[PDB]
Design a protein that fits this description.
This is part of a larger assembly, with 10 protein chains of 10 kinds.
Chain B: H1 3-11, H2 21-37, E1 46-49, E2 52-54, H3 56-75, H4 78-81, H5 86-104, H6 109-118, H7 120-130, H8 136-165, H9 170-175, H10 181-194, H11 203-207, H12 213-221, H13 226-234, H14 239-263, H15 270-289, H16 294-325, H17 343-354, H18 361-376, H19 380-403, H20 419-426, H21 430-434
Antiparallel strand pairs in B: 1-2
Chain G: H1 4-28, H2 57-90, H3 95-98, H4 100-116, H5 126-143
Helix pairs in contact in G: 2-4
Chain J: H1 3-7, H2 24-38, H3 45-51, H4 59-76, H5 96-99
Classes of the chains: A alpha+beta (49), B mainly alpha (446), C mainly alpha (84), D mainly alpha (19), E mainly alpha (133), F mainly alpha (144), G mainly alpha (150), H mainly alpha (110), I mainly alpha (161), J mainly alpha (106).
The structure holds cardiolipin (CDL) (2 copies), 1,2-diacyl-SN-glycero-3-phosphocholine (4 copies), 1,2-Distearoyl-sn-glycerophosphoethanolamine (3 copies) and ligand ZMP.
The site of one 1,2-diacyl-SN-glycero-3-phosphocholine has 6 residues of chain H, from helix 4.
């Protein structure tokens, strides 16, 4: 962040993430495919947060 | 266990040695690390040594006690800069922490009672010794006489349970069941005062204000949870009668949560507003305890664990403005974003933890508590929405008015923020987001 | 970035664009009532002219405490914080 | 370049580096 | 250092009513030529009416205050940099004594400025001893 | 220099106690006005301006404290929280009464709910039949 | 390979898949010792009805197997719910027809869970479910099934 | 009225004296140079603090205070407790009688 | 002795002239001279000098230990493109390496050590059926899984037990 | 103080940390040791210990036993979840004349 613009750092980082998410979104429209990942925290009474 | 108890018993002679204030908190964090290591606990009692054992509720409460006392030695550097009695302060803190470990790792009801009412004498000593107010006498007498007046007939109830059953152990007393009104009132009302009700609270906002920072940590961090632990141990054999008489306490606690949340919008002290803020969250804890569900008990344990950190961390934040601006008044505390901008991160991170926050354990305790109370009756959806809305209506007011706006004119020059204070409010918030990871530890004590 | 000469030029330009004030009689030390013929509502028009010119709001006590164009220069230079 | 009146940020940066 | 006095004259009251009436007229009529035409109309309305007595002037001043309260715009135009504007006091400047609480290594970044500040401190303490001491 | 030293005292029954309480609160005797003798009402504390909040007070006056808009040694109002600049204060007095605003809003709301829910079964439709979906038991026909 | 987007995704998947498979088969798969870990099996201790009131040894053991059976039956209901969720995701347009036997099995699982462990509270001993079963069987004997009782 | 202007002038003289006291005490170089933080001693702040803390000494059990304590606190508590008890008794008699099925009961905790 | 203020006495200097309303009610000419001197004092001619003690105290040895080779990369490109154009390509080299390291670690974790039936706390991935259009292999296609045990198995069908 | 005094600061003019205000030696030792006993012991090594903590609660064993039980219960096909705690033939219910007027709760 020193000797550089934090706005320029955030700009380049979010263009890279936006391009990656756009190219992922075009792959998920060709297949009509839905992913759903799940991370358990605590289980009680057969109900999982 | 006996390792932690004998560790504190041999840490007692550290107080009498001169220039030994900072080694005691080092060894306290070391024994907190050792207590993090000894975690082989399940819902039943384990590490049975004589009359001392531990289950998961007791594990979380002893770990919270050790963390709050270890941060309590870290917060009180005003005792170390002045020549106020460091040896007596360290001895009182070690004795009080030992009594809290002994009353949480108690296998039986009577030793729990004995160390439970032994714990209020070092809190009395801290309030009347190390506070900075003329009304410390009004602070300690209200606390002692409230708790003693409602906890003396609990001893008659305890020996009535002993005479009817025979034993003092929690498991053998879980088998029996009593159908008496006065036994229920004796064994409940002492904990109903020890956690804040609406009607019986008075000792709380008049004992948090006039105490020291360490009295505030020990009162809002672990001694509003002695009553919660006591009700979690007593409610198991008084289910039929509490199902008859629980609507009165739940209705009083919910309306009192709404009313005390309306009180904090008309409060002009930082330390008083967190004192009334402890009443509102423990009202939700009390309303979820008496429904006797799995979710109510688990979310009550989770919210007491997650409240003893956040209320104490808020009480450290009101201390570091009282040390510099010279008063606890909310009118004086204005625009601290331009005075201490790096502190404002910890103000909003610990004020957001008081309400529902995204990564904190307070939300996972509040979600599992509102589940049981909405499951208890549909009429509670009207007043849980009002209470949980007014909670962030008042809790955002303390951060907003203290940390935003024009600066208070006529303030003299004070020191800047310190690394000890940043470390002190670091350890009040990173446990709140590192314990959602392995949250089946700090929730499923059953 | 402003200057005292620039603000003086602003004040004399606005006061010489007023058709009820003669530019021959106009001066930096000229009094608004005794030296120049102005109504009580004319000075309010001058005050809102300075408000629309300089882009702020002048209160009523500071409206009645200004009697000279040099007083208006001193009031503007104190508000906008220029002395050179 | 006018000098802005900012409070001290040395202790916060030293706390961040120590952490 | 003239602190303003709270008594308001009747001429000051009608001047304040004239100022607020033209500010409301500027808020209602956005175009400058229409606002100028209506401002000359309102100035003629005031100028036909200034020859009356004092009690009638007080009663008609109260009537004009009631009229201006009746015709007040819902979004009155105000200057942004002044008080009550859209962007008043957007930044808050802390007092300079926090500059005295910097680190000496942080103070080494502006040593001429801090030396001039330390020179000015003696002038300020002699000025304070002259003024209030 | 504590809360027991500077505190409100007993109610001024007599005039000399009222003068002493006026001089105690750094207020001129004419300005001072205590509260009522009811159970809720305070004793010996001045009753300050309850007309309109801090935003009504003059922001162009040179204050000792620009925040809260007060001078030094000026008695703070008892409901200073409710009459603060943040909550329930207006810079200018409101144009209408309090009930006109709510009355117009619930009038427009009642008219819109009534006119919508009267017309809930008069929705228009194109000259179109039901959408025919294929079924193994029920067959449909074309027009050719 | 039939689309430019599909070919680009295949190339990105190959570049992603290459080095991690090299790191597994080249570094992680060698130097890993072979050990055996086992699923714990618990013998069936006799329940809360086949012991006396004065004995607290049986109450602890039957309470512990009641807690263990509660956690196992909670995992039965959880896996039967996850089966319905995977049916809903895998049969995305046509979830109405195929997921019905799974939803009926899950609803029967919820009903049987509320028969056994329902309305017991936070303190559910092994004897409390047994007394609930005794009163439920008595009410089924004298009043018929619950839902049409008198 | 001529009595109004004298009152305003006396209040302005008192305000000028208090303002001169504030300008003397707020920019004190010795009090700033002590290093201990604090505020200029304002009497009205301490009066406001003791007004907010101490309020029982001016309290008497009158009819207005009893009406406020009844209609503000006790009556919503009583109405809420009556509503909760009535709803729970109405659901509990349906639960104990057997008018609800096993698979058709809300909040199974499943 | 410990000096929190650097050894100099902290005090206000500019006085009552910092407020805009106190500037307008009236000024003595000594206050005008003081405000003009304060405004000439507040200006800065040159920027802040690079104090090496601040860089020494505000950087732990671990930070220098993990930033040394990229600092050598920036230093060997320092006379080629200047300071500004070499620190940019230094800062977007290590950050791109961190992004690729995180992508490779996440790819390895979600496809080689995902959640199975023997562990609760992992990331349990559920995938939907891909759409099959003509031109793909096997366009007459039904659901491959039909058994209730095939749904949400999490690798239970390959269990050794 | 002059320009060269601020350009090279004196080592005796040291700003304290929050721990001690008497000498510089006790600040550094207590600061480094307090950051040792909290960050790299109670937050990192303790969290690494709690990450690889074994099944104290039997939640992983519950999931494995649930998968094996749902494998074996639907093979027998009697019940995915058993509704009864004991067998209905093993339990000896009291007769209607034995109970009399007792509160049967459902
Ligand atoms: C480990 C060795 C292998 C990886 C590697 O080469 O690491 C670079 C590492 C040193 O790189 P670096 O330049 O020190 O990177 C940190 C900067 O100093 C950081 O300096 P800065 O001032 O640019 O800081 C900006 C800030 C903000 O940067 C970010 O937030 C990073 C965003 C990009 C990375 C995102 C990671 C997750 C991607 C998911 C997809 O960066 C960080 O907070 C860095 C840590 C980010 C989280 C990890 O090691 C080596 O080069 C060899 C040793
Ligand atoms: C054709 C081209 C040829 C030339 C190519 C040249 C270039 C090729 C490059 C290819 C490789 C690129 C890098 C691949 C990813 C790294 C793989 C690796 O380290 O594998 C070893 C190992 C894989 O173990 P495994 O045998 O596959 O898994 C079986 C275990 O029983 C399973 O247990 P586990 O504990 O190992 O869990 C799996 C692990 C998997 O996680 C990951 O792989 C991603 C996260 C770690 C990334 C580390 C940097 C990379 O997840 C975790 O460790 C989760 C955190 C657990 C607690 C950590 C300590 C307490 C933290 C409290 C806060 O992974 C690790 O040890 C990862 C953790 C490293 C420590 C992280 C500490 C915090 C920072
Ligand atoms: C109310 C205070 C007076 C209660 C008097 C009656 C008690 C009694 O005799 O009970 C016998 C009953 C019955 O006792 P028993 O079951 O042993 O009866 C044996 C039969 N006789 C007596 C004939 C030999 O006790 C109970 O129901 C159990 C309670 C025992 C402990 C009683 C403590 C009394 C104090 C109650 C305080 C409640 C509020 C606490 C908080 C507020 C304090 C201000
Ligand atoms: C103040 C303490 C709490 C009072 C309210 C709670 C309470 O006692 O509820 C029980 C009950 C709640 O009523 P309830 O629900 O028991 O009434 C049922 C009435 N029938 C049978 C006709 C449907 O409280 C009261 O009845 C009185 C409430 C307080 C009255 C004023 C007390 C002043 C002191
Ligand atoms: C770098 C290494 C460490 C990080 C890492 O990769 O961890 C992987 C792990 C997952 O891998 P894992 O859990 O399989 O690995 C741990 C393995 N054992 C148990 C053997 C130690 O963690 C994460 O991915 C963390 C995700 C966090 C997402 C947000 C959680 C909070 C949500 C709260 C919602 C409810 C609020 C109320
Ligand atoms: C009262 C407070 C007393 C002091 C407490 C100090 C902090 C202790 C925190 C211990 C819990 C913990 O961190 O567990 C690690 C946890 C333990 O979880 P785990 O890895 O065992 O996963 C299984 C556990 N469940 C089922 C809950 C998911 O580790 C992780 O989750 C690994 C990924 C961490 C996320 C990334 C962090 C930043 C890198
Ligand atoms: C039909 C129409 C229904 C409208 C419903 C509106 C609900 C409330 C919205 C939030 C109101 C609010 O608090 O506004 C913020 C305001 C900030 O100050 P502001 O008034 O804007 O400034 C001008 C000078 N005072 O804040 C304030 O002035 C006061 C700050 C404290 C507010 C406390 C909370 C009061 C909320 C209103 C009561 C109703 C609550 C209903 C909760 C339902 C929950 C399900
Ligand atoms: C927030 C998003 C985080 C990343 C999520 C990526 C993801 O979900 O990738 C999974 C997807 C699986 O696709 P696939 O492997 O074809 O399907 C299974 C059959 N083998 O794999 C892919 O989509 C891989 C193809 C990605 C194409 C776009 C790449 C953009 C640049 C990435 C660097
Ligand atoms: C930041 C963390 C990494 C972000 C990128 C993760 C995705 C990497 C690229 C996708 C990939 O590896 O695809 C290949 C693979 C195919 O899996 P396969 O077994 O063939 O298909 C059957 C699925 N059951 O695997 C998959 O397609 C995996 C399933 C889809 C991706 C799941 C994870 C998406 C990103 C999650 C973000 C949060 C991660 C938190 C943990 C970070 C540390 C690991
Ligand atoms: C938009 C809404 C506007 C509301 C009302 C504006 C127009 C209404 C006509 C004038 C309103 C008045 O009340 S004018 C004041 C009444 N007094 C008089 O003018 C009669 C004589 N009184 C005087 O002293 C007059 O000289 C003045 C005009 C009051 C003093 O100003 P100058 O010193 O003449």
């Amino acid at each position: 962040m020193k000797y550089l613009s934090i706005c320029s750092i955030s700009f380049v980082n979010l263009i890279s993430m936006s391009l990656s998410c756009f190219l992922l979104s075009l792959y998920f429209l060709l297949n009509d495919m839905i992913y759903f990942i799940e991370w358990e925290l605590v289980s009680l009474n057969s109900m999982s947060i | 266990m006996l390792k932690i108890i004998f560790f504190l018993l041999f840490l007692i002679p550290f107080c009498f040695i001169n220039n030994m204030y900072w080694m005691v908190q080092i060894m306290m964090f070391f024994i907190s690390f050792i207590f993090l290591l000894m975690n082989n606990f399940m819902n039943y009692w384990s590490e049975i040594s004589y009359f001392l054992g531990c289950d998961m509720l007791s594990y979380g409460l002893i770990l919270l006690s050790l963390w709050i006392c270890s941060l309590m030695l870290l917060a009180s550097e005003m005792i170390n800069k002045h020549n106020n009695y460091k040896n007596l302060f360290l001895l009182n803190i070690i004795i009080l922490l030992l009594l809290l470990i002994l009353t949480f790792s108690s296998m039986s009801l009577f030793m729990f009672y004995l160390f439970f009412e032994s714990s209020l004498i070092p809190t009395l000593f801290l309030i009347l010794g190390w506070g900075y107010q003329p009304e410390r006498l009004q602070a300690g007498l209200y606390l002692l006489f409230y708790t003693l007046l409602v906890s003396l007939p609990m001893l008659i109830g305890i020996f009535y349970v002993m005479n009817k059953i025979g034993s003092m152990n929690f498991y053998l007393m879980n088998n029996f069941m009593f159908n008496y009104d006065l036994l229920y009132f004796c064994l409940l009302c002492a904990f109903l005062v020890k956690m804040p009700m609406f009607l019986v609270h008075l000792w709380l906002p008049k004992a948090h204000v006039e105490a020291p920072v360490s009295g505030s940590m020990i009162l809002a961090g672990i001694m509003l949870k002695l009553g919660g632990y006591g009700m979690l141990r007593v409610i198991s054999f008084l289910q039929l009668m509490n199902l008859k008489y629980s609507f009165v306490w739940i209705s009083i606690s919910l309306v009192g949560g709404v009313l005390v949340s309306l009180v904090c919008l008309r409060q002009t002290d930082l330390k008083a507003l967190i004192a009334y803020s402890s009443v509102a969250h423990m009202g939700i804890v009390l309303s979820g305890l008496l429904t006797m569900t799995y979710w109510g008990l688990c979310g009550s344990y989770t919210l007491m664990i997650a409240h003893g950190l956040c209320s104490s961390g808020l009480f450290c934040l009101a201390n570091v403005s009282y040390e510099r601006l010279g008063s606890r008044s909310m009118l004086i505390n204005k625009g601290l974003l331009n005075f201490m901008p790096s502190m404002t991160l910890w103000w909003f991170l610990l004020s957001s933890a008081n309400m529902a926050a995204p990564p904190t354990l307070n939300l996972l305790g509040e979600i599992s508590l509102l589940n049981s109370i909405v499951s208890w009756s549909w009429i509670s959806m009207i007043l849980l929405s009002f209470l949980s809305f007014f909670s962030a209506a008042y809790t955002l007011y303390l951060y907003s008015f203290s940390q935003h706006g024009k600066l208070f004119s006529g303030v003299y020059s004070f020191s800047s923020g310190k690394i000890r204070e940043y470390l002190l409010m670091l350890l009040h918030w990173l446990p709140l987001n590192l314990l959602i990871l392995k949250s089946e530890s700090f929730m499923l004590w059953l | 970035p402003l200057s005292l000469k620039l603000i003086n030029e602003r004040v004399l330009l606005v006061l010489k664009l007023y058709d009820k004030i003669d530019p021959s009689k106009l001066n930096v030390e000229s009094h608004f009532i005794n030296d120049l013929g102005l109504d009580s509502l004319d000075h309010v028009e001058v005050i809102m002219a300075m408000e629309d010119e300089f882009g702020f709001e002048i209160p009523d006590s500071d409206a009645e405490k200004l009697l000279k164009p040099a007083d208006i220069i001193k009031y503007v230079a104190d508000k906008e914080d220029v002395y050179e | 370049h006018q000098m802005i009146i900012k409070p001290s940020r040395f202790q916060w940066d030293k706390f961040k580096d120590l952490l | 250092a003239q602190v303003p006095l709270a008594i308001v004259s009747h001429k000051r009251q009608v001047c304040s009513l004239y100022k607020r009436a033209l500010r409301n007229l500027e808020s209602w009529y956005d175009r400058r030529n229409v606002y100028r035409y209506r401002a000359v109309q309102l100035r003629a309305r005031f100028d036909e009416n200034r020859s009356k007595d004092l009690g009638e002037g007080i009663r008609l001043l109260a009537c004009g205050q009631r009229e201006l309260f009746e015709t007040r715009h819902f979004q009155p135009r105000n200057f942004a940099n002044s008080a009550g504007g859209c962007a008043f006091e957007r930044e808050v400047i802390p007092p300079d004594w926090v500059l005295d609480y910097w680190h000496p290594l942080e103070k080494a970044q502006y040593p001429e400025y801090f030396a001039k500040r330390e020179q000015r401190k003696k002038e300020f303490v002699t000025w304070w001893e002259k003024q209030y001491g | 220099g504590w809360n027991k030293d500077y505190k409100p005292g007993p109610y001024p029954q007599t005039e000399k106690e009222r003068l002493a309480a006026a001089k105690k609160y750094y207020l001129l005797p004419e300005e001072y006005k205590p509260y009522a003798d009811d159970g809720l009402g305070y004793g010996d504390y001045p009753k300050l301006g309850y007309g309109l909040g801090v935003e009504a007070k003059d922001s162009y006056y040179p204050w000792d404290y620009p925040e809260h808009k007060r001078n030094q040694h000026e008695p703070i109002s008892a409901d200073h929280d409710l009459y603060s600049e943040d909550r329930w204060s207006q810079a200018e007095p409101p144009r209408y009464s309090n009930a006109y605003y709510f009355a117009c809003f619930l009038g427009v709301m009642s008219g819109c709910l009534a006119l919508y829910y009267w017309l809930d079964d008069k929705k228009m439709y194109r000259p179109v039949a039901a959408k025919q979906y294929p079924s193994p038991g029920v067959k449909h026909y074309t027009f050719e | 390979p039939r689309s430019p987007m599909a070919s680009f995704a295949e190339s990105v998947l190959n570049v992603i898949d290459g080095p991690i498979t090299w790191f597994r088969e080249s570094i992680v798969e060698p130097n890993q010792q072979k050990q055996n870990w086992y699923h714990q099996r618990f013998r069936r201790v006799p329940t809360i009805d086949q012991c006396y009131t004065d004995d607290a040894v049986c109450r602890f053991e039957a309470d512990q197997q009641f807690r263990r059976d509660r956690m196992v039956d909670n995992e039965i209901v959880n896996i039967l719910r996850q089966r319905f969720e995977d049916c809903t995701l895998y049969e995305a347009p046509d979830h109405m027809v195929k997921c019905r036997p799974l939803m009926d099995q899950y609803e029967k699982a919820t009903e049987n869970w509320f028969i056994k462990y329902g309305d017991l509270g936070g303190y559910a001993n092994a004897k409390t479910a047994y007394m609930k079963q005794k009163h439920r069987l008595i009410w089924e004997r004298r009043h018929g099934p619950v839902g049409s009782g008198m | 009225s001529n009595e109004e202007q004298e009152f305003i002038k006396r209040k302005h003289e008192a305000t000028l004296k208090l303002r001169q006291e504030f300008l003397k005490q707020s920019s004190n170089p010795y009090r700033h140079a002590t290093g201990e933080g604090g505020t200029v001693f304002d009497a009205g702040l301490a009066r406001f603090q003791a007004m907010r803390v101490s309020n029982y000494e001016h309290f008497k059990p009158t009819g207005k205070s009893f009406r406020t304590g009844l209609f503000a606190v006790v009556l919503p508590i009583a109405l809420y407790a009556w509503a909760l008890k009535a709803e729970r008794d109405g659901r509990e008699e349906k639960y104990r009688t057997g008018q609800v099925a096993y698979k058709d009961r809300q909040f199974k905790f499943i | 002795g410990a000096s929190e203020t650097g050894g100099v006495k902290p005090m206000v200097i500019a006085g009552r002239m910092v407020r805009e309303r106190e500037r307008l009610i009236g000024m003595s000419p000594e206050e005008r001279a003081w405000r003009k001197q304060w405004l000439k004092d507040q200006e800065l001619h040159h920027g802040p000098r690079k104090v090496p003690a601040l860089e020494l105290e505000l950087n732990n040895p671990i930070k220098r230990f993990y930033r040394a080779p990229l600092d050598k990369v920036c230093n060997v490109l320092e006379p080629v493109l200047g300071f500004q154009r070499a620190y940019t390509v230094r800062f977007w080299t290590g950050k791109a390496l961190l992004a690729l390291t995180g992508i490779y670690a996440g790819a390895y974790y979600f496809k080689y050590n995902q959640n199975d039936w023997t562990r609760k706390g992992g990331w349990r991935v559920i995938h939907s059926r891909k759409q099959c259009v003509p031109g793909d292999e096997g366009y007459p296609k039904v659901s491959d899984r039909s058994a209730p045990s095939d749904y949400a198995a999490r690798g239970f069908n390959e269990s050794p037990l | 103080l002059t320009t060269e005094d601020f350009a090279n600061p004196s080592p005796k003019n040291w700003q304290s940390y929050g721990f001690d205000y008497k000498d510089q030696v006790e600040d550094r030792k207590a600061t480094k040791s307090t950051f040792f006993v909290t960050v790299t012991l109670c937050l990192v090594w303790g969290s690494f210990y709690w990450a690889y903590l074994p099944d104290t609660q039997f939640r992983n064993w519950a999931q494995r036993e649930g998968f094996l039980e749902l494998r074996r219960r639907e093979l027998a096909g009697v019940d995915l979840v058993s509704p009864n705690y004991v067998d209905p033939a093993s339990i000896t219910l009291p007769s209607d004349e034995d109970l009399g007027d007792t509160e049967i709760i459902i």
